[PDB]
Structure formats: C-alpha cells, structure tokens
Design a protein around this ligand. Sequence first.
Ligand code: ZN
Ligand code: ZN
Ligand code: ZN
Ligand code: ZN
Lengths: 64, 79, 114, 48, 1136, 144
Amino acid sequence: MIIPVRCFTCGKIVGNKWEAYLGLLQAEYTEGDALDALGLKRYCCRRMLLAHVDLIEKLLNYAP
Amino acid sequence: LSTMIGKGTGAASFDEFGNSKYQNRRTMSSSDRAMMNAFKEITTMADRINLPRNIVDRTNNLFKQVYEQKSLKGRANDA
Amino acid sequence: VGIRFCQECNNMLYPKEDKENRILLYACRNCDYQQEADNSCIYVNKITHEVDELTQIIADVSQDPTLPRTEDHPCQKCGHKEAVFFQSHSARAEDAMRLYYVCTAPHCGHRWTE
Amino acid sequence: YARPEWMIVTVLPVPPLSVRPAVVMQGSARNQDDLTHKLADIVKINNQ
Amino acid sequence: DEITPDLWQEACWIVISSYFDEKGLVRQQLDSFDEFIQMSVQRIVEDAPPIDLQAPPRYLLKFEQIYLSKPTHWERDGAPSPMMPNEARLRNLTYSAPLYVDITKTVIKEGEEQLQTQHQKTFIGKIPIMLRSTYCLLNGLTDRDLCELNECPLDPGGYFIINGSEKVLIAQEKMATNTVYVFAKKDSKYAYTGECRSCLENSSRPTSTIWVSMLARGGQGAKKSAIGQRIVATLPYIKQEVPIIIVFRALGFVSDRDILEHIIYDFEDPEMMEMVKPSLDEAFVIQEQNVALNFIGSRGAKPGVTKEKRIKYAKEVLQKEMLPHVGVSDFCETKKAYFLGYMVHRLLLAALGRRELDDRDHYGNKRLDLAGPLLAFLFRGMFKNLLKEVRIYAQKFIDRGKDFNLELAIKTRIISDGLKYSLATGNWGDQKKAHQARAGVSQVLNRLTFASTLSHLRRLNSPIGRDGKLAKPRQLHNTLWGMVCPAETPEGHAVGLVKNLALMAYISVGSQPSPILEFLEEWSMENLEEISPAAIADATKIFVNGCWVGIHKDPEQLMNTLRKLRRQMDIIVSEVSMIRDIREREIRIYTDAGRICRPLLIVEKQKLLLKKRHIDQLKEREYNNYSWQDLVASGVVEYIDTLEEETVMLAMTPDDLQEKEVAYCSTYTHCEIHPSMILGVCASIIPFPDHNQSPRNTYQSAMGKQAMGVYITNFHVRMDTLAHVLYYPQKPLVTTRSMEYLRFRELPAGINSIVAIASYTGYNQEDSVIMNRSAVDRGFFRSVFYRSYKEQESKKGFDQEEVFEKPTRETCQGMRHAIYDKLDDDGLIAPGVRVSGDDVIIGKTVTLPTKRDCSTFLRTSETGIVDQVMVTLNQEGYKFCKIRVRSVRIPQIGDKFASRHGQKGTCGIQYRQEDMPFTCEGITPDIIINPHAIPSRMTIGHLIECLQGKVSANKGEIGDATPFNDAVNVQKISNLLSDYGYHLRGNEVLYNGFTGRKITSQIFIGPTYYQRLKHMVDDKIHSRARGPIQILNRQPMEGRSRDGGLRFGEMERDCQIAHGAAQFLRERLFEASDPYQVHVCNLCGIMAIANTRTHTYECRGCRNKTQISLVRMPYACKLLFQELMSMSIAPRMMSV
Amino acid sequence: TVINNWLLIEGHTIGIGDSIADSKTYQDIQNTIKKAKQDVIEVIEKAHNNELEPTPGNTLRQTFENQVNRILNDARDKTGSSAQKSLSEYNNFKSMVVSGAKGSKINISQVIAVVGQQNVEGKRIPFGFKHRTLPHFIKDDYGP
Ligand SMILES: [Zn+2]
Ligand SMILES: [Zn+2]
Ligand SMILES: [Zn+2]
Ligand SMILES: [Zn+2]
C-alpha cells in the first residue's frame, strides 16, 4: 500500500525516496537513472522502488 | 411433522396403467392447513408493499394468537 | 445388385422365380406386380470392398485451404502444375497412407492416385 | 433364533431416542431425526 | 502500408490492448445477462399465450411490455431508495431490480360490448442484477464516481449479490443442440447411434432428444444375420424403440421409393441401399400412415383406450415432441422427414465408414450456458407459474360471478424468490424438484486474490459429474486451443472438468437467424420444400442453427458472400459461425449462444489485412474514437468459433509463417494476434511458462489463486468472512505483456524476493524454505487476516426473542468459560479491543420458554483486534451487526510460499541477517530454496526469471517474460547481466554467515517473485485431548473449529494390525473414542435395563434380574446393535 | 549432521549456467534433430508412395508409427546422450543425478537437448481437428 520504510534485504531506508523517485521520473529520468540518482546501488534496494506499487493513493480516493 | 413420497423411478413404482400406486396424501390438520394458508396470504400482501420480513414475522405471530384465541372465528381468515 | 421399385405403388421390388418359365423375375410384395429380371444377379457381397476411392473424392476439395498443395504432380488431364493431395481417411480400409491428388485448376476436377 | 413367520413384520420395533436423537440448531427448535419423521408416517397410517 | 516484422511485436500488443480496453475480461458474463434482461425477458413474456377466462363473461389478459427500474431497496417505513452494491453487501440485501409489465384486460360480456383496460407497469417481482451490467447502478459511472460509492473501479462486476453474498454463475458446458451426432457404443446393443438434442428457438420447453440407432450384429440367426443390421428410432415419450421406417410411414411417406428418397439422395450408390433393406423388411407389415401412427401410439406415454386416441396421441408426439427444432406445426412433416432421413443418412455414412464418428470432446459440438441462457430458463418456469396462479386466482372470482382485481391475482414472490433461491443456493431449477436440479451452478465469488476473482468469473464447468470418473472428458482436447487455458485446471477429482476461458476467448451471446434465412432465400438457395430429392445429391445442404433450410448449387460463391457480409457487418453479426464441409457438401450456419470464439486476424493472399494505418489509428485509441470494434468493422479481424476453426488455415505469426520460405502452406486464412493468448488469467502471470514442465504451470495456476495481496482496492469498506491483505505487495520485476490487462500491477499478489538456490543448513530440503528473519522483521511478506462475524437478533415465536446484551452468569441459563467482560452495554464489543481465543465478541441472549446464551465466541486460534463493528438492519429488517477482527500474520515457520512456477514450499526455518549467507556486497537472500526442487520439476522458467530479475533490478527496467518471444533469450539475458558486474549465469560468491568463509560453490542468487499463500500453519495447527463428543455416536467432534478429533480410519486400523499393536489399536478405537458400558442378559444376548441408582438390573423378556453381565464395548457398537434391532435383527452378545 | 555442516563449506546450488551446453553440443543436438526430421520425412514419403511394407503382426498404420516413433525416440536418446557428455564435473544437474538425490538423465536431456515426443494414451498427439492436430497444420500432417 505504501513504500516500505526499509529495504527488506539490507534494511536501507527507502521510505524517504518514493516522492523523490516519482519526481525524477517526472523529470524524464529513466528508472535506472532515477534509482542511481537516489543512491540505491544494491539491486536489493532498486527492487524496493522499481517494483513498488503505491496503492495508498487509491485508498485516499475513498472517503473516510 | 411428515414425509412426502418421492416420484416413482422404475416400472414397479407405477400401477398397472400409468398412474403411480404410491401417491402423497393430504394428512395436514384443518387448523394447521388454514393457518398455513393465512401465512401464505400474509407474505403475499407484504410483498405487494415491500414490507420487511420482520413485520411479516410479527404479523404471523399475531394471527396465531388470534387464530388460537378464536374470538374472530366468525370472520374470514383473510380479513 | 441393382435396386428397382414397381411402377404401380413404387415399393421395393424383390427377386422371384417362376417355375413355369424358369426365368428370374422381380415381384412387389404389397402390389403383386411382376417384372422381368435382366441383371440375373440377386446381390453381390464385397468382403474386400476395394472401392476406388477416387470416385468417393469430391472435386470441390481443391477449394480447401487446409489441404496441402504440390506443384510436382501436374494434372494428367489439363497439365496444371498445382495439385492438392490427401489421404483417404476412410474406415473399413484397414490401411490408408497413400495420397489422392485432385487438380486445383477450376472446372477441372481431375483426380488420380500416384 | 429365526422363524420364517418372524420375517413378516407384525409389530414394528421403535428405535430408542438415542438411535434417533433430535439436534439443536438455530435456537431452541428441535429438528427430529429421519427415523422419527418416518415413524410418524407409520404411526399415522396404521392408526388410520 | 504494411507491418514489418521489426514492428510486429509492438503492433500486435496494441491490437490486444484495444481488445481489452473495450471488451474487458468479464464480457461474456455481462453480455449474457444483458441479452437476458433486454431480449429474453421480453420474449418470454410476449411468447406467453394470453390468459383466457370463461366461467358468460370472458376475460382476456395479455402482457405487452416489460419495464425494469434501478436496483431499489425499501426501508421498513416503505420509502424506496436506490440500492448501492456496497449497501447490499453490508446489510445482506439482494441486488435486485423491480420488474413491471404492461397488462391489457379485455372482457367480453356476451352483450356485444368489449371493455379494454390496461394496467401499465404492473409489478410482477424483482430480478437480481449482475453488477456493472447495463441495468446496474454502477453502469456508465466513471472511475471517480465508483470511488464515491465505495466501489473498486478495478472490480469487473459480472456477479450477483444475493443476501449480501457475491454469487457467480459458472458457465455450464453442454452438448450443442439441434445437431446430429453419431457415436458408437462398444458394449451397447447398437453398433451406432445417431442422436440429436432438438430444442425450440429462444429455448422454449426443454430440449427433446431423439436417438436413431443401428442394431449390432452380435445377434446370431439365419434371418437376422442374412438381413444384416436394422435401424430403430427412440422417440421421446415412447417406452420402446420404434423401427425407423415406421416413423417415416407415420409422417406420411408410405412408398419405399419416397422414404428412400429422403434417406438416400443417390440411388446410384448400391452400398447404402443395401444398408436400409433390413429396416424396410422390419416395417413391411405397416403399409399405411394411420397404421404407423397407431403403432407408435401403442407405445405412447399413457395407454390408448381406443385406436383414435392412439393415432391422435402419436400425431401429437411427432408433430411437436419429435424434432421440435425442425418444426412444431402441422405442416412440418416434410421438413422433419428430410431431417430424419438426414439422421439416417448420417448413420449410414458412419456405418459404411464414409464419415468419421463425432467426437464428444470436440467443443464445436459443445455449448456454454451463461447467466443469460441460465436465467432465461428459470424465468420461463416462474412466469408460467405466475400466469398459472393468475389463472387460478381469476378462475375463483369469475366463477363466483364477480370481477377480479388484476393486481391481487399476481403473486410477486413467484419470480422474486424463485430467482433469488436458485442464485442463493446454486441448486438449479425448483426447490421442490431439487432432486433433478443442477448443483454448483452458482458459487460465492472468490475474493482471495484479484486473479482468483477474475478466474472465478471466467470458469467453465464440464457436464460430466465430478463423482464419475472418465479420462476422455478430463483430457486436454486439441479444440481447447485459443478458447480455454490449457494449464489452468484444478488438481484432484476435478482435473480436466473445471476449465477457464482463454484470454481473448469470447462466448457468443446468440441472435436471431431471421436475417440470415431471409438473405439465403434472396440468394440462389433452393427451398427444401420445393426441390426434388434427386437434386440433393449434387447440391450442398444448408444448415442454420442445426435446421436444414435448403440446398445450394454454388457453395463457394455463397460462402464468399457470407464471409464478405460478416466482415462488413452488413447482415451477419460477428458472432455468427459459417462452416462449409467441402467433403460432406454441407454448409452449417450457427447463430445461437454458448459458442466459444476468439478474434483472429484475417489473411488474404499471404498478407495480413491489418496494416500500419490500423496500428497508428489504434496508437491514438483515445481522442480518436478508433477502437477495437473498428478493426472488426474494417474486416481485418474476425471472431472464429471452434467449428469454423476446423476449416481455417491459420498462421501462428505473420513475421515467419507468411514470409516466403520452404513451401509448407501457401494458403493461410487467419493468423494469431499473439500465441500467448491461449493462456488464461492465472496462467498469464507465469513468467517464461514455455520453459517449465506443463504440470508446474497448472500447479502455479492453482497456487496463484491462493496468493495473498490486495484482492480489491476498497477492501476496507468490505466486511468479508475471510480476507488476506499483504502490507507491501510488489509488481513482479519480470512481468508478461498479458499482466497489463489483468491489472496485476494495480493489485499485485506477491513480493520480489532475493532468492538463493543453495543447500545451506538442510532446513530447506524437500520443498522447504529458509526465510530471512531480519527481512520479515521489516514487513517482508507480512500480512493481515480479516475475519468478519455476523450476528442477527430475531424475534420469532409467541414469547421467544433474541437481543444484544451482556449475559449475566446468573440471569442467563447457558454459559461458557469464556470472558464476557469485553462486551459493551449493548452486547457488542468495541473496535480497537484486543481479543484472543475463548472471547465473546457478540453478547446474544435468547429468552427461555430465564434466557439461554447464544453469544458468539471468537475463534480459539484467532488472536486479533476488533477492526470494525457495523450495526444495521438486515434484509429481514432485524437488527444486524457485523464485527471485523484484524489479526496480523507475520511469516512463521511452516507458512506456505511459492514462486510463479509451481515451486511451493513452507518456511522451514528463519535465520537472522548475520546468520544468512552474504555476497561480497553484503546482500543476504530473503529466501533460500533447495536446489533439489529444480531438477525433477524442471522449472527452468524459474531460473530464467531469477536471471532476468537480476538484470531488471540492476538495469532498472521491468523484465518481459512473455512465453513465445524470440527477442528474449537466456544468452541475451546473460549478456546483459555481465554488463552490470555480475556473473553472466547469475552465480555469485557467497560467504557463510556463521563462519564468514567463502562457500566453495558459487550460489545462483537473484530477485524472484514469490507469493505468500493463504495456508498458514497457525490456521491448521490443531490439538485434541478429551474434547467434546457428538450426540449420535458419542465420539470426538469433527472439524478443527469444533475441537474435533482426528479420524483413525480403516487404513490406520489396518496399519496397526500389521504392526501387531493390539492394545494401542484398542486404545485408539475403543478407549480414546467412545468407551461405553452396557448390561446384557446372560440367557439372551440382548441388552438389559440397568438402574445403578437402585442397583436393579432386569431383562424384560427373560423375566430374570439375577444373571446380568456388564459388557465394555464402544458406544458405536451399541448403536449398531440397537440400529440392527430396529431392523428386527437380534444381535445376541454371548459371554459364554 | 556431519555432512550437512560440511555442506556449509562446500555448498551446493543449481542455476542457469548448469543448464547451458557448449555451442558444439548445441550444434550436435541441432544436427541430430535435423537428421531426425529428414528420416521421418523419408518414411512418410515411403508410406505416401506405398513403398512401406507392413511389419508382420502390425498394420500399415502401426508400422508407420513404429518407424516414426523409433526414429524420434532414437533421436531423443542420441540428443540426450550428447548433452550429458558435455556436462562438466562441476555441473550441478549432473551432481544431483550421479548422487541419485534428485532428477534423472532424462531430466537433464529435456532441460538441455529436447523435451521429446508428447504422447496421449501412449500415442502421438491425435487429430483432434479434422485430420490435423491444430489449425496451424495442413491436413494429413504426420510430421514430428
Ligand atoms: Zn537493500
Ligand atoms: Zn407395388
Ligand atoms: Zn487439371
Ligand atoms: Zn434376557
């Protein structure tokens, strides 16, 4: 639903990079380039963002 | 409480000429038969105006007491 | 082998012999009609029944897009190079792997077996 | 131990309740056994 | 211009993208229901004969028009309001729309005066509404609107909400009707049997089947052997087989020549003539139509008192009961004679071996009954009942001489309840007639996973009963290509019987054949009633929906004209099948529903009619109005059914098969849009499924249905009995093109995991898995389990009622050792309260005739937190409460985990990050699987996905694993991986976490998409130690939820016998199950009456009370003996 | 216990690299298959030309299938053997087969060389369609 706080493999913090990752892609960055710009070198972390699905945005559509 | 005979399957189940020898019999009591019909009528009226089942349940209870009390025995069951 | 019906009530005609003339006759049961027999053969039973499959083949099969087409077997009648070949796939043969060729040229439904 | 006439049902045995117990489900409304249901038909017809 | 091979891969998936953008995935469900409501319901009402009353005044009733409103709910005060689908789910309502009909009442009073009155929009019941259908409230609502209604836009609909239960009608597979099929029974007395299941147009009174069979030659006799084999017909309502020739005589054809003219179209063929000779001899006695009719009437359903009745009955059966689809009028004898002769002619060809026997497994001979045809069948009976009671009610009032109120004559329960009951229970037909009712038609929609939800809506049910066993129906027939998923099928008794549609596969909704028949008459087609029998030999028979309409002398031109019309959508709709049997000189046209078809690209002169312009137009699918339907209109893509596929020469791909090459096939008629479309919803999520053993692909198909994730976006609003939600679902790093159309990205059901295939500590052996404890601590595969408890307080009885309250141990009679403190004053627990086993969430008390306790106890194993406590009024108007308990499921040892390649495995052990092996970069695998799982299973696609996933994560691009893609190769993937500083084969040097030493062998490690399966150990762990016992047998209860005992079955009993463990066998079967004691008379082995309180033991029957023996035997043995006694048996236990 | 703890040092895996074969091996497998294709074609021509003499005790159809199956079965065996030879001592597929822990030589051949003939009820794929297995094949297509 939401980007995980830590990378499941090594525990690197990735919950502060989703908005930045989205912004980079909005800036025409390729997914690989955006991940590199965010410092995610280990492919375990690149997996965290490259495969993340932000369903929480859909959940916010429904009224509380 | 009673059991209804099922439909025949083999030739032995049918009489010498077509009709099944084993036929269901009306063993329901007259009081129960009338009461059963009244509940069927109650449900029919409720559906016409889309009344919830709980009201129907209350109505069925009311009729049973009225039917058993027998003060309105002279009046039609539908009324 | 042939089948005949009486001209009177159009019912099946069955063979019958007349002792007086000793000549085969075909007589109708429900009609009493009689006819002279010319075939002289009541019936023939073909155990092998090696019926020429070419007769059974229909020339229209050349219009089938799923049948293979070969240009190496020109039509013997019209000489058309393209031809369509296939197997009998008829039961009671007990064996069928030979190819039956039909000319693909329209209006020339020539059929042959190599 | 076995007489041929005994094979003819003269008196029908009625199983104990434990053989045909009623099960409680969805409130205090006993649901009688199939054997109990059948016994009613037998009791009604023979009485009739 | 033309699509080059370099652009074909993009072009075809654009075509596929448009198809799903328009059709969706539950189109067959919605389209079928739409046809039923729009057409079938009106047709059934119109087709109903006017009701005529005469008992004098004469009353006529006619139902003119059918009106349907929005799904409406009525509050207890009577105020109507639109019923939102979410409301029905929460309040356990039925999603149904009020049904109204215009009725015209005309009365003739014998005074030459007619009074006509119309009762406009007369309510006649409620029809359940398929969600998102044309008549559904959600219909035509934008995604934003659906969100405002607490409805998931991704929800495909296609299901019914009955009493709040989402119900899906499973497509029922049946043999095609009105079609002549010849089968040979090896054991039966008939060498061959030609059957035809004839049904009326619009599916009137159910199908009538007629069998034409040829007697086997097994019978030995001088007369029987000489004549040969005779043909007999099994007409409906006839006890015994009737000789075929007699039937023709009854039709009005007496002369042998006339009869043979309808059976044999070429008298020049002697072999066929000899076949019918024995049949002629059999019916030689009967030489008159009336005599033939009397003979048939003799075997009628009821005995005929007189000959006139027998003849009349026989004509009645032939007129309508025999070949009804051919005709039901009195002038149809000639039409039926031709069709009956065709059946005989077909039988002769099979007997002669000239025509191959029909295959039951061929789906060209099969039809799928969808909700539309399904619901229409029910509605016909209910409406007939509605008119039956209307006639009955009106008869009573007209008999008394008083006029009748039309509204009071209509019983709305007939349709409202009848439709609801069939969907509610799944028993198909009538509740009274449940014996013959088809079961399993309606099932509760599966919400475990979105793919599972999608699969359930595309499921197919085979006619063969599950209990029966037969390989042939369970086999993967060739005709399943492109129509049904070859991999998706359940394991067990249902293998090969329950099926799922292929990705583009579509089921024809059916249409009227009138336009086709009219065109055929306009075209140079000779009517069957006008031609002579001699002309049939050369001409080709024309069949429309199984009815022989006529003959044509130019089949090739007619087929081309018909094909042109369908491609242009002029007179022939897309879903019409036109099949020309060139060898058999037959053209079959099909227009009914239930025909499975898929879209195929049209090929002309080895060239695709699809050009670059169509692709470009599709590329701008939006703001252009160019859609998939334009491709069909353009005539470049058409739908092909199974039957027409036999006559289609198809190309797998245009890039290779169309191109000039070694001459194999220069005449191609169609081409696949993409070969990967043969897979279903579940099989479509397998990456590289063409590299795995086929059984593995099937296994994953089942496993994918059980994978946790987000089954729906609005799950929070829903209150489902069971629901599993994964915290952090991930879209696969390696995906397939089809996955875009499954919405798998929007609702993923797994996490991409760093998987190392190594033998680390032996804790992953035998399909076991080692998980990373640290990763799990970070939310890895962590999930929610949501369980909803619904309780209803209902007052029914003179003084008996149920209420929600806290039951005091003194006030209420019933009580349990559970805890009742959590309950609030209103008898309902509050949200946010931790609840464990043996806890009361709902305090329900029923007044005692002081009050018994019916409180709801939380599941013993369950330990969660009350999530939601919803209170409302149910469909019955009683107070209704739903309580959702939320429990967090952290992956434990024993929890099932599977890849997308059938490699399922429980967690054997969880190691911390330091304990796990690590690469030089410090990466530890999230999961470790045994290498031994791969070789035997040959799940090579699993290895490729791991290799591709490694490239995808490093490259930053989602990998493509479409099965049949030459552009992707292992060498290609390996080369890409080398570019990122990794071994080209995915191997890495791993260090022992316990010692830090390099492992001698380099480990295959990489990202792989795994999924947590619903099966969790905590939900399966069960222990029994002197629990409760069942009343009937006094043995341990059954079921984990009931704290029941494990069954010690015969096999276990047999096993201990081989072991020789007599006492343990005694313990299990006697001591641990039902130790019981009885008193038995010594004289007679019958049980004696024992009064332990009085210490008096007597045997009524022996008049003795001094010699009674106590016997220790199982209670079941007592029950058996008692039960045997009920059958007059005397099991006498003798101790001597 | 003893060897499990030793395996923590030596280790054991299975991956793509163990599924690969030398390009020379691939050529040998491809050549063997190509030869098999011609051999079946030659037999088909003999049957088509009525040049096939039925084996005693078997029908012409049975003889044709026996020859075709024998040719393809031999090709599968030859291709499987070729793949096995190419495997090195470090190959993990061979490791689990020689030990007998899991898999068989057939599994290795299928993963590397060819899956082989698919049979239904002991026979090749039947003509579920009219004289053909699938709509993508011409009628009377008896090729492998
Ligand atoms: Zn990381
Ligand atoms: Zn005659
Ligand atoms: Zn020619
Ligand atoms: Zn006694």
